[PDB]
From a paper:
Among these mutants, a class II mutant T114S-S115T (abbreviated as ST) yielded EC crystals that are suitable for structure determination. This mutant has a kcat value comparable to the WT but its KM,NTP is about 50-fold of the WT level. The much lower NTP affinity could indicate the alteration of the catalytic pocket at the NTP binding stage. Interestingly, the ST mutant-derived EC structure indeed exhibited a previously unidentified conformation with the −2 to +2 template nucleotides clearly occupying intermediate positions, while the product strand almost reached the post-translocated position (Table 1 and Fig. 5, S6M (C0) structure, 2.1 Å resolution, C0 indicates that the intermediate state is in an NAC prior to the corresponding post-translocation state of this native EC). Although the nearly full-register movement of product strand had vacated the active site, we did not observe NTP-like electron densities in it, and therefore the incoming NTP-assisted translocation is not evident. Previously determined native enterovirus EC crystal structures all adopted the post-translocation conformation, and therefore it is probable that the hurdle residue mutation relatively destabilize the post-translocation state, allowing the capture of the observed intermediate state. Comparing to the pre-translocation state, the template +1 phosphate moved by 2.2 Å toward the upstream and residue 115 backbone amide nitrogen interacting with the phosphate oxygen also moved 1.7 Å accordingly.
Building on the previously established methods in assembling enterovirus RdRP EC and in capturing various EC states, we used an EV71 RdRP bearing a C291M mutation in such approaches, since the equivalent PV RdRP mutant (C290M) was shown to produce higher quality EC crystals. Building on our recent work reporting an enterovirus 71 (EV71) RdRP EC with an intermediate conformation of its template-product duplex, here we report three types of translocation intermediate crystal structures that define multiple nucleic acid conformations bridging the pre- and post-translocation states, both in the regulate forward translocation and in an unusual reverse translocation induced by pyrophosphate (PPi) and divalent metal ions. These structural data, in combination with enzymology characterization of the RdRP, highlight the key role of RdRP motif G in controlling the critical movement of the template RNA strand that is probably the rate-limiting step for both forward and reverse translocations. A striking common feature for both modes of translocation is that the template backbone, in particular for positions −2 to +1, stayed fixed relative to its starting point of translocation. As we pointed out previously, this phenomenon is probably related to two motif G residues (T114-S115 in EV71 RdRP, “G” symbol in Figs. 2d and 3d) that create a hurdle-like steric blockage right at the +1/+2 junction of the template backbone.
Author numbering: 1 to 463
Write the structure that this text describes.
RNA sequence: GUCUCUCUCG
RNA sequence: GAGAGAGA
């Protein structure tokens, strides 16, 4: 992805889009019970902790574009992935506006608390003024679709969240690039049925884990990914995507039967305009972060990428023996023989992709079930039923979370949520966690899940 | 102040 | 109907 131009909003006529510049994050009553280094992300150019120019740090993720047109490898990769999707029998017909707004069994209703985006946000119109759960009204939505149309700019907000000290000094805050309600509705009508298929079928046929619940999904993954594992990290995946990957996605959507009218929406993703503060800017390439379908299309593009990388770097790859699941840029894959990701990464750099080792070291070391991570969780067989796999979240991450709060009124829910993640690390580590929580007065006031009930609730998910 | 999952409360 | 947490 590459910024093509930046203009004042005076010159483009776009409304200003401003988000909060003060963090809601404050130290919690556990701030000194646990160790951690993270602090709230920089939200303002005048943050005293910055050691670089903030806005330049924010937009450095757009590293440029390399390829624009699919080569032979990307074409074969796209066709192989699309052929695989055919068995799912995706409904390529347009989803009704009423389903698209108010939801189906496998597609959540449009959230009425998340932004309506441009221009409704700037004008002061919330979604509750357009959409109504009770009435399932689509009349006003049709009106506003006609009034403001489509290809509206993406509203850019900085995300208020914890970050490591290094990312605070270098201003590497993360951006939400929120699509207008009109484009969301339009994308959900065009692809809502494919979204349903993906949400209902996380696994190695979609090649996607969007919609999975890790508590149950983890036990399927060693069976879905037989053989030798491979995985790696991307640096700035979404923003590094060149236009070739959107051309490749068009190839996939066409081959599984989408109308040219539907396929034509992809160029509106490849080429997007954004408003941040009082400026408009054009981005060519790059996936917007707050678009309807960001995770799914990121995941689909990843399926094309891994296939293309394999057949370009190695001779004799049989793609039918590849198994992979992606959640956006996060990937876990397997193949009958070990795959050298040092070579995959070399090829990836030609495509404009920066790929680093999974274990965060400088060397591409072996990935196996004892060290693999997906969605930030490891894989730990249950000691009693070894076919049941615990998703393990490192206590370090849980420790970072519990030391801060955006509203100490919600301390109980926050601590409970963390306990539901923590117990998978085992009884000893969990009770150590609970003991520390209970070492301060507020901790003695909280209802904390008992390990045995947690484990028994989990086992019952498998019936 | 994006989506997915999970939990909690009327 | 409202709130939170984590992940991407
Ligand atoms: Zn443009």
């Amino acid at each position: 992805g590459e910024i093509q131009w930046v203009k004042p909003n005076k010159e483009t006529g776009r409304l200003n889009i401003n988000g909060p510049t003060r963090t809601k994050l404050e130290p919690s009553v556990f701030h000194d019970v646990f160790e951690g280094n993270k602090e709230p992300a920089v939200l303002h150019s005048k943050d005293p902790r910055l050691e670089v120019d903030f806005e330049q740090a924010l937009f450095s993720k757009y590293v440029g574009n390399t390829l624009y047109e699919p080569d032979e490898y990307i074409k074969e990769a796209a066709l192989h992935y699309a052929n695989q999707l055919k068995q799912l029998d995706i409904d390529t017909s347009q989803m009704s506006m009423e389903e698209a707004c108010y939801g189906t069994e496998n597609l959540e209703a449009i959230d009425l608390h998340s932004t309506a985006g441009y221009p409704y946000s700037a004008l002061g119109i919330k979604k509750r003024d357009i959409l109504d759960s009770t009435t399932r009204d689509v009349s006003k939505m049709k009106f506003y679709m006609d009034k403001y149309g489509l290809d509206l700019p993406y509203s850019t907000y900085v995300k208020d969240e914890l970050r490591s000290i290094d990312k605070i000094k270098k201003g590497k805050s993360r951006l939400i690039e929120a699509s207008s309600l009109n484009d969301s509705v339009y994308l959900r009508m065009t692809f809502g049925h494919l979204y349903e298929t993906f949400h209902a079928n996380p696994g190695t046929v979609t090649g996607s884990a969007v919609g999975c619940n890790p508590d149950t999904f983890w036990s399927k993954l060693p069976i879905l990914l037989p053989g030798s594992l491979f995985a790696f990290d991307y640096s700035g995946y979404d923003a590094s995507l060149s236009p070739v990957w959107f051309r490749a996605l068009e190839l996939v959507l066409r081959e599984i039967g989408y109308s040219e009218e539907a396929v034509s929406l992809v160029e509106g993703i490849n080429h997007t305009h954004h408003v941040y503060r009082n400026k408009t800017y054009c981005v060519l390439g790059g996936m917007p972060s707050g678009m309807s379908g960001t995770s799914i299309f990121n995941s689909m593009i990843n399926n094309i990428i891994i296939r293309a990388l394999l057949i370009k770097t190695f001779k004799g790859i049989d793609l039918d023996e590849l198994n992979m699941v992606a959640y956006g840029d996060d990937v876990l894959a397997s193949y009958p023989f070990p795959i050298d990701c040092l070579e995959l990464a070399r090829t990836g750099k030609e495509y404009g992709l920066t790929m680093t080792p999974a274990d965060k070291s400088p060397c591409f070391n072996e990935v196996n079930w004892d060290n693999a991570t997906f969605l930030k969780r490891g894989f730990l067989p249950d000691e009693q039923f070894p076919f049941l796999i615990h998703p393990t979240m490192p206590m370090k991450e849980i420790h970072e979370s519990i030391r801060w709060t955006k509203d100490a009124r919600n301390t109980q829910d926050h601590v409970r949520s963390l306990c539901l993640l923590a117990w998978h690390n085992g009884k000893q580590e969990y009770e150590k966690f609970v003991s520390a929580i209970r070492s301060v007065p507020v901790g003695k006031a909280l209802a904390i899940p008992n390990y045995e009930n947690l484990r028994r609730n989990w086992l019952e998910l498998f019936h």
